[PDB]
Structure formats: C-alpha cells, structure tokens
Amino acid sequence: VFNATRFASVYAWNRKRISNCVADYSVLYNSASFSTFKCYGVSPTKLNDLCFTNVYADSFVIRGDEVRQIAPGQTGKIADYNYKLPDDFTGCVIAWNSNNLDSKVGGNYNYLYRLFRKSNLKPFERDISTEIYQAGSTPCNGVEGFNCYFPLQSYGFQPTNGVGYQPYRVVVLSFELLHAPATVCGPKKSTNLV
C-alpha cells in the first residue's frame, strides 16, 4: 500500500483490501516514512491501540496544490471531478513527497486526473468515461473545440518543480468499525478470561 513503487492513478485508483492480518502501526513511527501524517476521523496514534474490521486503503498520486481539495465537504477540481470523500468521511489522510522518484524528466504520464466533468462525482465512485466535456450547445462529436475539452489530463511531474507542483504520494485510509467481526488487530497477545 504505502511502500509500493508506483501507485494507481487518481483518475482510476486501486482500492487495496487489508483483512485477516496483524496491523502494526508502530513501524510507521519507528522507521521515518510519512512526511505528512494526519487523521481527521481518528487519532494518528490510536490506529495501533484501536483496530477495525474492514480496512480499505485508496492509494494514488496527485499534484501538491491538489492535495488540500481532498477532505470531507470540500469542493474543487479534485473533489468534484475525479476523487471525492464523503461529507461524513472518518479516516486518515497520508501524504509524502515523491519528487525524488516519481518525477521523470519532463513529466510522468502514468498518473492522470479528470479536469472536466459534467456533474459532481459521488464519493467513493470511479468514473472512467473520457467523453468530451461539453459546456456549450455545439456538439463535440468526440473531439475538442468550442466548449469541448478532453477531460483526461496528465500531471506534469518534474524534479525541478516547486513544492506546489512536486508529486506527492497520497494514501487515504478508510475503515469500517464495529459493523462486523474484526479480523485485523494489532499484535497484542491475548490474556486469560476472568
């Protein structure tokens, strides 16, 4: 999830399932990895002391100035179009700077995003439609033109760009709590029953 080489795109992102395992979150503090680690719905420290039933990690990479638009209730070119979190979102936002790796010469075309969308994409939904965005009354006919824009755009990633344009690997941590049996819990040895 976090240490993978190349994440999926934020246009179409892979959701990784963490289940039937031991989740040790103290390694994240023993080996310094995360540059920005903040939990909006929970405490970043209590992920180890509190364990969850179904853990879903959404891994992707976006431009730096596009990170702030990802949060519950926010509106922007990210939240409204390609990747949205619910208004009641309870989870953790993790990001760190991959400029030293993901940046390739003039750009990295493996990470795309939706610049144009005809409506507001619902949270936790993936829309792969590339249909030309039509803002006017003239038909686009599948090509760009007057009020016709190709919605699927790539992030410009260069090692010399400023911190606003540098690629940041972003992993959004979502969970389901006390709605099912808990298969994922930390390495706490069980004790005797009294």
Residues in the site for another protein, rule: CB under 8 A? 41-43, 46, 49-52, 54, 56, 72-75, 87-88, 90, 124-125, 135-137, 146-147, 177-178
Stretch that binds a copy of itself, among 12-20, 30-38, 98-106, 152-160 (CB under 8 A): 30-38
Residue of 15, 22, 33, 45 interacting with a copy of itself (CB under 8 A) = 45
Q: CB count, 10 Å around CB of 98?
A: 19
Residue of 30, 119, 141, 191 interacting with a copy of itself (CB under 8 A) = 30
- Which positions from 66 through 85 interact with a copy of itself, judged by CB under 8 A? 75-77, 80
- Which positions from 97 through 136 interact with a copy of itself, judged by CB under 8 A? 115-116, 135
Nearer to a copy of itself, 73 or 159 (CB): 73
- As measured in angstroms, the least distance from the Cβ of 137 to a copy of itself is 10
Kindly give the pairing relationship between strand 91-97 and strand 36-39: antiparallel
> Which does residue 26 bind out of a copy of itself, another protein, none, counting CB within 5 to 8 angstroms by kind?
a copy of itself
Q: What is the 3-state secondary structure (H, E, C) of the chain?
A: CCCCCCCCECCCCEEEEECCCCCCCCHHHHCCCCCEEEECCCCCCHHHHCCCCEEEEEEEEEEHHHCCCCCCCCCCCHHHHHCCCCCCCCEEEEEEECCCCCCCCCCCCCCEEECCCCCCCCCCCCCCCCCCEECCCCCCCCCCECCEECCEEECCCCCCCCCCCCEEEEEEEEEECCCCCCCCCCCCCCCCCC
> Which does residue 49 bind out of a copy of itself, another protein, none, counting CB within 5 to 8 angstroms by kind?
another protein
Give me the residues that bind a copy of itself (CB under 8 A), please.
Answer: 26, 29-30, 32, 35, 37-38, 43-45, 65, 75-77, 80, 115-116, 135
